[PDB]
Design a protein around this ligand. Structure first.
Ligand SMILES: N[C@@H](Cc1c[nH]c2cccc(Cl)c12)C(=O)O
Ligand code: NA
Ligand code: NA
Lengths: 384, 381
């Protein structure tokens, strides 16, 4: 339940039971030969795992320092790492005997991932989306409708991801008998942060095998973008006990850390309770959760996963920020140099890895998690 | 050069030299250790090959008939099989000492695939695109711009761009490679493109043997020019028991005069440097084609598919625009795969054939692309 001083189950007594059952179900199926066979089969034949580890020779040679490798989560079915978790929790829910999936979404990528997995396994999908996010993401809303999922708009509060998350929890209390709440990051009450991380750990496990095969050694640095922290925990977790491997999470620096217009929870936030967890949250002087900003909608969350809060306190992972402008330059650079259009979320990771590569030895190795493809982001890259 | 009676290099003397020098280079590299090592490395680490072979169990049991496997070219980098051919020709170009790639596109897809492959290999990419095609497909124009390609605006259709690109190549062939996005045109393009897409059928073979212990009874692929169909078909061509079915665009209807089916209702002729079936009027001028799927909207068809209809090795059917849209929606709701409207044609015909077959039998449908590109078109309907 706890990652050092961070995490927990900060929920009403109505949710304690549901989460008890979820936890008992996960303990059972986590190691069940049939669950893991099914999960592995769907990840291989349906998602297209294992994703490749691509050596960006031209980017590497242009910067003239560290070998830059890209973990290509952009190539997974749906175009984002979110599919790995979406499949895992939908299979669990199915085996738990649930018939309906509910999910929060802000970017819409978790909504699409939940809708695909719900369509794959023949479950009803209800996507609680902030009313502001629905109008922001008209195309992703259409994809979800084509996949057979209903977008239920959340009109409460900031009408964003925070509000969508709590509306969904209020439904789950009523519906938990026949419904699994499918959380799309390493956030929320226990056991969600552990489950989401366990289902994203496949990224790191592949990437470790692939970098040992390609270079015959572990990476010097692993760089991943952090919204809630699922793709980052995914690639980090298997290297956590490899002490020489440096872990760097890149949060949304937005319009600048000094601007107040960002999502860098771990850089600028204060320890607090929201969405049923004890973690770093952007807070005003009064102590209320402040609004977040990122050009990358997937990094636009005021909070961060508790396990990242733990990794920051023990100083196992360093957390940095990249601005909207640095991310945009990286979006263009990776496109022109490697013919790969990265998600704006992922372009944060690429932006920091490029600055870090320049300062580093030619023999040294950076793995960047390329969390998604940028097809969904072309309109906003156009506007800028 | 020849696929029985069909094929050839039916081009002006100015293009004969370039095509002969390309032909000599392909011979050199097609079996070279280093070329194939470099190509396989890019297809593996950049493109994400091999793509999976997916059993659509919910679709299969819903039909009640044969097992429906989907070959998932939707999951290759760029979201279409076209990447396999783009990498192949682009790397060949680089090893030939070419510094520039040029291509033509209307739909935009082949433009993007060339831009991606060009960027990967650090070669200049000039895409010729008709001003009328540009305005319709503004997002693919940005995509190419992002990928560092120079989109050169040109009835402002595909034709006027092809002629502009053939005038470019005649001059620039010394440092430039013309990248062709289907098994069409003069020799050696129809052979080269099929060879670079054949990887689909070799993967699909090993994968279906691992899965079901036996080769498929039928293989179903959509057919515009016929690269994705040739890619999955070709390795299985010698396996006599394996039936091959290409699906063309039945459009508004095969009798409606708004289709793109060349192998059904087309007459043998010489256009675009090749001897193959084309959609022709009474006068025998090439008629315009219509398909809701932009990739299937080609007046003609590749010569090797003409050869396969002639020796009756491959049956060639059309599916209506309406049937393909029902297939697009069905596969999305049933298997949570949003297919390309191109691919949906193959899926639409696969759903008919399955019901009229035994539950023990196997259909492999080539899912040629993902339907992210075709969302604005499906919204219209
Ligand atoms: C995305 C989907 N759900 C989230 C929760 C929390 C944070 C993020 Cl980025 C997400
Ligand atoms: Na954050
Ligand atoms: Na045709």
């Amino acid at each position: 339940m706890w990652f050092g001083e961070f995490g927990g189950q900060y929920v009403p007594e109505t949710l304690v039971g549901p989460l008890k059952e979820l936890e008992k179900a996960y303990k059972r199926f986590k190691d069940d030969e049939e669950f893991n066979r099914q999960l592995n089969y769907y990840l291989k034949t349906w998602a297209g795992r294992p994703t490749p580890l691509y050596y960006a020779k031209r980017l590497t040679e242009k910067i003239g320092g560290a070998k830059v490798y890209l973990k290509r989560e952009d190539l997974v079915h749906g175009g984002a790492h979110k599919t790995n978790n979406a499949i895992g929790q939908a299979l669990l829910a199915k085996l738990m005997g649930k018939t309906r999936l509910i999910a929060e979404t802000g970017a819409g990528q978790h909504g699409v991932a939940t809708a695909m997995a719900g369509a794959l396994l023949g479950m009803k999908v209800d996507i609680y989306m902030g009313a502001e996010d629905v109008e922001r993401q008209k195309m992703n809303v259409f994809r979800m409708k084509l996949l057979g999922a209903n977008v239920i708009p959340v009109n409460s509060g900031s009408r964003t991801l925070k509000d969508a998350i709590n509306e969904a929890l209020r439904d789950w209390v009523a519906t938990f008998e026949y419904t699994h709440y499918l959380i799309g990051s390493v956030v929320g009450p226990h056991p969600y942060p552990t489950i989401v991380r366990d289902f994203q750990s496949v990224i790191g496990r592949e990437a470790k095998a692939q970098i040992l095969e390609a270079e015959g050694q572990l990476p010097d640095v692993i760089v991943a973008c952090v919204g809630g922290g699922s793709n980052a925990m995914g690639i980090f977790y298997p290297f956590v006990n490899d002490k020489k491997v440096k872990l760097v999470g890149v949060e949304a620096g937005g319009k600048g850390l000094e601007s107040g217009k960002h999502s860098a929870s771990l850089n600028a936030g204060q320890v607090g309770v929201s969405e049923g967890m004890l973690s770093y949250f952007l807070q005003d002087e009064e102590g209320q959760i402040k609004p977040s900003h990122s050009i990358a909608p997937g990094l636009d969350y005021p909070g961060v996963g508790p396990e990242h809060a733990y990794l920051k306190k023990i100083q196992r992972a360093e957390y940095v920020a990249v601005t909207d402008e640095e991310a945009l330059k990286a979006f263009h650079e990776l496109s022109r140099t490697e013919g790969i259009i990265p998600a704006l979320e992922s372009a944060h990771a690429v932006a920091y890895a490029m600055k870090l590569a320049k300062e580093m030895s030619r023999d040294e190795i950076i793995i960047v998690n390329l969390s998604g493809r940028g097809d969904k982001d072309l309109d906003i890259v156009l506007k800028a």
